[model samples]
Target: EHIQKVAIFGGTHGNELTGVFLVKHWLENGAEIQRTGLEVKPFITNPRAVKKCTRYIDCDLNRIFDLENLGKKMSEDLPYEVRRAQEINHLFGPKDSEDSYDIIFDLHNTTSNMGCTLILEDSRNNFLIQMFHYIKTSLAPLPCYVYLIEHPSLKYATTRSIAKYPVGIEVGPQPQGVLRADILDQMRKMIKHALDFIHHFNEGKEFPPCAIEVYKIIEKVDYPRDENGEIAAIIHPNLQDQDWKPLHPGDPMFLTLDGKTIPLGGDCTVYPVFVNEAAYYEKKEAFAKTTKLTLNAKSIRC
Candidate 1:
């Protein structure tokens, strides 16, 4: 089978209005980014939630990357975003030569002043880093740093990205008073440029030089309180250096009891604040029913 190529963007956690409009504009007015006989698959991760302007219908689509949930179909008791992912996965058809992907980008945005981030899967391909540098410096001009993320179902998932590389580009938020149309235009341009860069790769062209920033997700902050007597996230009034301070495990993460900042015990790094509601309560019970098992999990061995 011959190698396939595609461009996909749209899993922007519902509330990110920029990506939703960007995808819509691209599908409608944007020109096709394709190399002559190569197929390019494109689909939205969650269209319904985009309409409702929520992070997700049931859960955040970005965090539900486990193999068990990925194996099911949209109609099979899955959440809205999960079902959308499943549908797209079926359309892509496995990570092989025929329908296997050559490039993948899960576009997203956040509510922090930390700027944009480009999270790359851990791999030996220095070319992916080069692409990041080109886009980050020349084309996109966004805040970007390379990081590692391991997904279990990505290995055997045929229709998903079997690309030489896959990346998650976290775009900056669309501030109020900003023209949505202009923002979408910039997004469309970035998508076109990325597709062109992939085409250059399929032709075995020499990629540019880019330094890879190895970023790690040091910690994840959840909203709920366990019997350990942890309280909810305390919102910071201002975006100061103190607010951006990293948190380690077992440190005084918060001081609701005495208004103090805690330190971390382990080598974990603190992530951005959770500006949404707490996790699903009754839905946690539904996890067992929707789980699955798989072998040869993940794309990169690291």
Candidate 2:
């Protein structure tokens, strides 16, 4: 089916200012987001959070989209984001239904060295694969990755899971509540190229099949903790800013308070991502390990 409707969401995490400012900018300008035969909507997802420059008022809006949460009834005790999710799910999706938005471009910025990462729930979507090809092929100068959380144990609660296609853009190395010019420009370029690709597809362009690499998450590695649950060590200087690099066993993974080196204990080698992410410190995740897999995509046509 053709993508007749698309939503560009910003402020999913309000402190992630690239998306917040970009969406806010587009909301006022409204000129550059136009695509023929497509209704593009610029939406500030967590408005209150954006206004206050906080991540959220109650629970995170990004993490509350699971079916059970969306199906939950309104109550006085419900968190602010759950109500927002229900309204959003009601207004934009009712997720996994035919009457949902065709595609959702969830604009996001990270405090990780994770540059221009496209997050996907799984690798089953052919349309997304084609879109990845388009974006990656055109974005040759920038470092980009297709990161997927295809684990069965994981749940899809992010904003874009509601749509038929999820264009979850995560561009980063920017500080929370701060906007870097380079990061903001990359995000704008990414979205523009995405819309261009869709427009080309709508005009009946069939893309060439190609090989692409995807990083699939295996597990998360948390910061070492003491009995008090205080983090015992921080990300090692050798490992910081080395995202998507092969982290082998016995590599310097952390440096403790006493200035002792801690090596990675895993036997196998894996690429690590979200290394020393500022936002994930709250979740105790130091980094996530991923396995890179090459995929062969078929030609894409609308």
Candidate 3:
């Protein structure tokens, strides 16, 4: 079967105003994202989080979608985000059922300077890969990218995982609880192009497969911490706002509180992403390391 159901969710993290506002905008003006071939639904996932202008009430809504968490019995003891996740699960469709959505776009914005990025959890999903190719070519010179996040330490519990094919759109350097015009414009284009691709494929357009470059997540680098776990250094002026740029050995990565500098000592050159992201300060992640690879994906004919 071809793609039939498509869902777009925003406000997964309440303070990211781009997605939050985009979802609200579309919900009011559904024709902006509607297509002739499939059912398109836009939703604000966490109403409380959006209303409160907080990331989540109890726990992060994005991290509460694993099998263990989703399978938990309903009770008052569940965190507010957990209960919200269950409600979202019920609305979208059971994860294990054939009635689940064919494509799910989990929209987000980061405080990092990572420009419009399509986060793909699966490398071999032909539909998403084809969509990436389409968006990349159509939006050439626009600085959009595909970021692949697959690792043992990271749980497969993100909101996008519930769909048969999930695509996450993250555009940023925008601050939480505020809006940026450029970020909002980029995110809107990404969503429009994605829906257009699915619509075209549904109408029997053949998307020939080809090799595409993707940034594969590797490991996270932490900030210099004090004796009591306080961060003692800040992102160096050289590395700040330099997402997807390569940082080689001896590159200045941090500026110490005492007005000193620290160079990255690793022998391997790695592309740093999510540099000094605001939401990641609590996670102790100063930045994430990634490697670029060219992967060949098969073409799709719906």
List TM-score per model, in order: 0.64, 0.97, 0.97
Provide the clashing-pair count of each candidate structure. 14, 0, 1
CA lDDT, every model vs. true structure: 0.49, 0.86, 0.87
In candidate 1, where is summed lDDT lowest over 10 consecutive residues? 285-294
The candidate that achieves the highest lDDT relative to the unseen native structure: 3
Off by over 4 Å in 3: none
Badly placed stretches (over 4 Å) of model 2 are none
User: Candidate 1 versus the native: TM-score?
Assistant: 0.64
lDDT of 1 by residue, 103-141 (tens): 767666643333445565654456565666556565535
Q: Ranking by lDDT, best first?
A: 3, 2, 1
**Model 1: number of backbone collisions:** 14
* Candidate 2 lDDT by residue in tens digits, 1-302: 67888899999988999998888888998889997676799998899899899999998898878877898879868888898898888878979999989889998887789888888776877778888877987998887889988778775588878887877999988888898999988999889889998988898988887777899898899999999999999999999999988988989999997999999886798898989888788887999989988877777887
What's every prediction's RMSD, in angstroms? 8.0, 1.2, 1.1
